Amino acid sequence: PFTIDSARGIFPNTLAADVVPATIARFSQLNAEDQLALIWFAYLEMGKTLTIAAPGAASMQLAENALKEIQAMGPLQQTQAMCDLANRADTPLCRTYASWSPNIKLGFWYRLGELMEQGFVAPIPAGYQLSANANAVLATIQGLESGQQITVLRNAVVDMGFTAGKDGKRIAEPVVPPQDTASRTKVSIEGVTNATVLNYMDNLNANDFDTLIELFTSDGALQPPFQRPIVGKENVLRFFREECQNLKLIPERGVTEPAEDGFTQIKVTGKVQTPWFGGNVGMNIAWRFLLNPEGKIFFVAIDLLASPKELLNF
Ligand SMILES: CC1=C(/C=C/C(C)=C/C=C/C(C)=C/C=C/C=C(C)/C=C/C=C(C)/C=C/C2=C(C)C(=O)CCC2(C)C)C(C)(C)CCC1=O
Ligand SMILES: [Cl-]
């Protein structure tokens, strides 16, 4: 209950899917062309059983100029531009890309994948063979659960580009209006009646970020899977608005324990759906909350779990 960074250690039995950042680190070592080929390969194979939702209209508008610029290039330049993004080279295109929210980056690559499939953007060279390190990276990816697979792909996408500066422009999709109160569903969690946890889940499912933020302490933090804590209400609200629209949280069961100094620690396990895949991918998730004596959230971590065997009382 003292520091955010120490609270990271609550529920240390929870086995997170650290194969995800492991695999991203291996991927990040590869030659840029192999990075692009490997994701092409993974995207094509995954597409046989899983369809990516179309990017939103607003997103596509925001990425349109950059997409047009690539589409107007000769094939060798197209391939160079894509390599620049993978290498995190400092170029205008890479700086534009870095300014984008994850969804806009994903929609940019969704479009390029379609154009590559159609032959209008320089495809991976015909009969391309991956490097020794890259073939093994792809094999690991293809052995993972779908929820882990899509997280590897998102993390690879988000990592591309070049950030120069701390307070650079941030572009994101417009904020959706919260769901009308009448049509809202309420979660049920075995074992857990805690109103802060239930209101967390229900407000996020309603895209009601202004209500959700009011659950947190001023200094409180939210730790997304495999990322550092996001600290304080302004930064956490920013993250909700830019990155947390249209999720579906399906918490199943939890456990509630005392912590030092009148705090309460609560662990919930369940599933989450991203609007990119809807009901076709259910990620196995734990939430770990540390609530102060008044019930506000000092810390919440969201973990992608190593296997369904990590869900409580499988
Ligand atoms: C790149 C590339 C390509 C294309 C690639 C493409 C098109 C790839 C597309 C990949 C896509 C669309 C991946 C989407 C992933 C979404 C995830 C993991 C969301 C998780 C959300 C979670 C867990 C949120 C949970 C949450 C909960 C519960 C909270 O309680 C609090 C909020 C929080 C957010 C933490 C080509 C094919 C063109 C080849 C070349 C190439 O490189
Ligand atoms: Cl998402």
From Swiss-Prot:
SUPFAM superfamilies: NTF2-like, Orange carotenoid protein, N-terminal domain. Pfam families: Carot_N (PF09150), NTF2 (PF02136). GO terms for biological process: light absorption. PROSITE patterns: OCP_N. Changing residue 128 to F: <40% quenching, decreases stability of OCP-R, accelerates OCP-R to OCP-O reversion. InterPro entries: NTF2-like_dom_sf, NTF2_dom, Orange_carotenoid-bd_N, Orange_carotenoid-bd_N_sf. It comes from the Bacteria. Proteolytically cleaved into a red 16.7 kDa form named red carotenoid-binding protein (RCP) which lacks 15 residues from the N-terminus and approximately 150 residues from the C-terminus. GO terms for cellular component: phycobilisome; plasma membrane-derived thylakoid membrane. Belongs to the orange carotenoid-binding protein family. Monomer. Interacts with the APC core of the phycobilisome (PB), probably at a ratio of 1:1 in a light-independent manner; possibly only OCP-R binds to PBs. Interacts with FRP. Detachment from PBs is accelerated by FPR. Binds FRP via the C-terminal domain (residues 170-317). Upon RCP generation the carotenoid translocates 12 Angstroms into the N-terminal domain, altering its binding and photochemical properties. This is Orange carotenoid-binding protein.
